[PDB]
Ligand binder design. Sequence first.
Ligand code: VG1
Ligand SMILES: [Co+2]
Lengths: 561, 561
Amino acid sequence: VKIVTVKTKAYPDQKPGTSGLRKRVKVFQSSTNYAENFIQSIISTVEPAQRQEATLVVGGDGRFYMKEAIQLIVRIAAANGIGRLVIGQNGILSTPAVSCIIRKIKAIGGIILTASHNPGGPNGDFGIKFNISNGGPAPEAITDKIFQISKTIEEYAICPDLKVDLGVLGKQQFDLENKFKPFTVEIVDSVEAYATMLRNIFDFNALKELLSGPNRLKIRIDAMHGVVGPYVKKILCEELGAPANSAVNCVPLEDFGGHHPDPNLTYAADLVETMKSGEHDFGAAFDGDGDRNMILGKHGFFVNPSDSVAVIAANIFSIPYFQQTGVRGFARSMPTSGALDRVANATKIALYETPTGWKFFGNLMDASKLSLCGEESFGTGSDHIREKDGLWAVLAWLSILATRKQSVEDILKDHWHKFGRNFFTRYDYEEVEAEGATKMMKDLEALMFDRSFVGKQFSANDKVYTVEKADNFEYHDPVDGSVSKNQGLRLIFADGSRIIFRLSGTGSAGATIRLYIDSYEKDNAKINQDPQVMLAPLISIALKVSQLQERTGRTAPTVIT
Amino acid sequence: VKIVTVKTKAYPDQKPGTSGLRKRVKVFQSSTNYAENFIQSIISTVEPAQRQEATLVVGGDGRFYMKEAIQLIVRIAAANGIGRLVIGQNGILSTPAVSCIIRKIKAIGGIILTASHNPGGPNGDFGIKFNISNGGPAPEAITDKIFQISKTIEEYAICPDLKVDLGVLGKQQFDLENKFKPFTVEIVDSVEAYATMLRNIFDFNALKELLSGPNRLKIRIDAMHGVVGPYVKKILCEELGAPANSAVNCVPLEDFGGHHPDPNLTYAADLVETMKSGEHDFGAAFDGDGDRNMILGKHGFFVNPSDSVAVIAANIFSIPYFQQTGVRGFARSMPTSGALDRVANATKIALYETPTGWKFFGNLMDASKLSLCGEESFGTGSDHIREKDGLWAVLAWLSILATRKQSVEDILKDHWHKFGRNFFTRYDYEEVEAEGATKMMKDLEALMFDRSFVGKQFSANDKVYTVEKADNFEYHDPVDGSVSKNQGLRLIFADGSRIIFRLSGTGSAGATIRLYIDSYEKDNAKINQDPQVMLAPLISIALKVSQLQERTGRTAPTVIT
Ligand code: VG1
Ligand SMILES: [Co+2]
């Protein structure tokens, strides 16, 4: 195979976000070699005297253009001196699977072709995630460095005539002009290593008994036409024995059928209506790249992803992985509710509040202080790997149900009566007013500096809510010293209740007021019923503050979750 | 899992020969003790200290009792301290494949569950073959230890509770009672290691333009319902590109479709009929083990097994394996035609004539003195593994077609034109009277050893045959030193023609007589003729000197090849 140094011209907009670089597919196809440069800056962070004995795991969620970008990573990494590429069969390879492979075969980093929860039709979105040696997301330093190379790039080394059959399992060698050691491409099965990893984490026999034994827990699983389909089929059906009727929407389609892979009460309507039938005890849908999960109960019941980590923590020892390693620490993103906190507060385990993104959880994990973490964006995980994991979280819920023997509804009613209830809703104001929320979200910072307000008696609706705290958010990583940026306000008090007033930082075209609300109830009666209605006191104080409707301008709902 | 010991009673008939233990299915089935007993002695030949750090490859052919016999192997090997078992997917692993996997990963040996060539049903046949560290079939020194132990087995260690899921890929780990290190079961892909091996031997790229480009060679390969089916679909149909409709009967059926998977024009009648119509350019029939093959050309042109090895040898530097590592030696069995001699003699490289039996090819391949070996019983192999390979032979044939850009007919036609034709045929006498055939060989032997016979002139038309050499074949193996006596009665004639008699019934039940006739013709007008017409005078001479009709009561042979 030939090697040719193709001169190119840099791009401005090639910068990664909270997780990887994502753009509209047109920006990939119409732009004269956009992916070739972003790929070349990635391999450039790996020093020349280190590439010949290095292995890059390249994966993918099956999305449109995945096939062409994989061909580019092979031809570009080949001409740049990378010794081996471990691609999954057909390119299909989950984000928790890529995190898992990297840690297993000691790979110096990994590239994932996925825009996650972003839609994927031929007119939708496509993206490039870059995981580092430790297995998880490259933290800001490495990503912005990729950005810093994307601006001053002048050329890129490529082997234009290197065509590889990604469908066939096996090792293949390629010899390129003057380089003693041959370029190797090792195509691995997609599910294998990942299933062998989950095998030593849960009791696969105790689960086998729960899904196809003495009564059969009727589960309904929606893979949402994304990469986790083959996994539910080979793992939950073919291995653990769940009936084929359980695995719905499990064939990876480029278009994802049309729907958006983000699993939630709006973007995932199909499964909730069929869960309202009452014949299913448990139900679960997944993200596009399979690292997010949504838990549902009998009759369409819903477990908030902020509550889901709280239950898989009070019952954490139902999972063998934790009986052998121990619970070194709990964590949650600042926007996720305070339910995990109530469980962490009742035991000798430390708790950590991190910025939204899986990239900074890893630092707590590597330094041995975090074991269970997750966020409101349907993303529960643990330190078994360094990425989020949708199927680990589903199988963590089946381990709890099988040991406890109760329904999903009763586990949480008991959990709410045992600690109290933390209400939550992601009720946003997506792209809305061009001049209102400027001064409004700069009005509270200063105004509260008066010594007479620490003690407010009430006369609205019912039940007194005593005063205590109130402030803002920033983050200093305890392991390497990284810092964060101002962005989201949060009004708190005695027990624990809050509105994360989110001003956008990267919002150029407009500001999304992505709202995260939290209400902590103590009593038996006011906890078990109503969702965005028992939240009223929090959205009473939060709606009265700035005279918002006549001082900013927005009273029409947008996208509730 | 609990390890328990069962006191057992031994069996005097459990004796492993060249191809392991071949008994009928209804002797392992309900005879409480038979399968467990034999496996126990197999893993007893490996020292108690050499077991924890050791692996054994296990596989079968996909028919009756194979799956049941693999659950038995894991339960006994585990209680006996074997570290790792590498089992193919579903238990399906072809014989050439097991030799490849044992030598690749360097296992201590391997257990092959295949019945050689007899059918595999409820009342049919079932066998246990044990290969050793170099990937070859165990020899006398080791089969006797196995038999000496199996007839004195008092106690046997088993894990009754060990349940292995054979269909799911990946490493399953089992912890046993009272043991600090765990037992490992690793399920491997059936084709993979074996395909990656062929990928280095042949040129898969030159074979892609050959089977699926514009100038496309239409083939037709019948897997005969045996284990070689999965390998033909993945290598020939998936990776090389041949249309899926070319690989026919490629699904290992539980019964094999009633008939024996053996390369014989009648056994492979479907293949012969579909190739007579005119359309197909290359055809092939197989066996339920993966060790033999029946090559056919346009319109039904038959390629003789003996000529096959002389065509591959004269065009051997076409297969990259040979261009890169050289040809250390050629070898054929004694009954095989002298067609390989005309090639090895002109292209001056050491030729080795050995007794019927792969075991003799292996020795020369372990002492690095043998590269390509051929055998009249539909076989052709090399030092790529340490067993016979039916698909390697097909792959070496397609390689020669792509390189020479001629039809099967013309490559044999112009070979006969440049080296001459060794008309060959093999008459078999099936159920013969055990003593009347033995006294037939002895009087023939006394007829050969007196001073006068080494110059006798025989005739049946125009050509006279002058006896040059006459001997009962003795082999002194240059590796084991061991001498193999008897072996066969050779009447070598002065013109290169030979008549060979072998009695294969000298150990149990009724005897079979195999009469091999080989005749050399060098003028181009006579090489175009029919073999049974051409060999007619030499056959009258064979039945005359033998007085076969007289001693066996047989006026015609059972099978003519
Ligand atoms: O603030 P953002 O950009 O919307 O971030 C959201 O999606 C990110 C990537 O998601 V996946 O789409 O990588 O599962 C997640 O890691 C964050 O937890 C989630 O809040
Ligand atoms: Co995701």
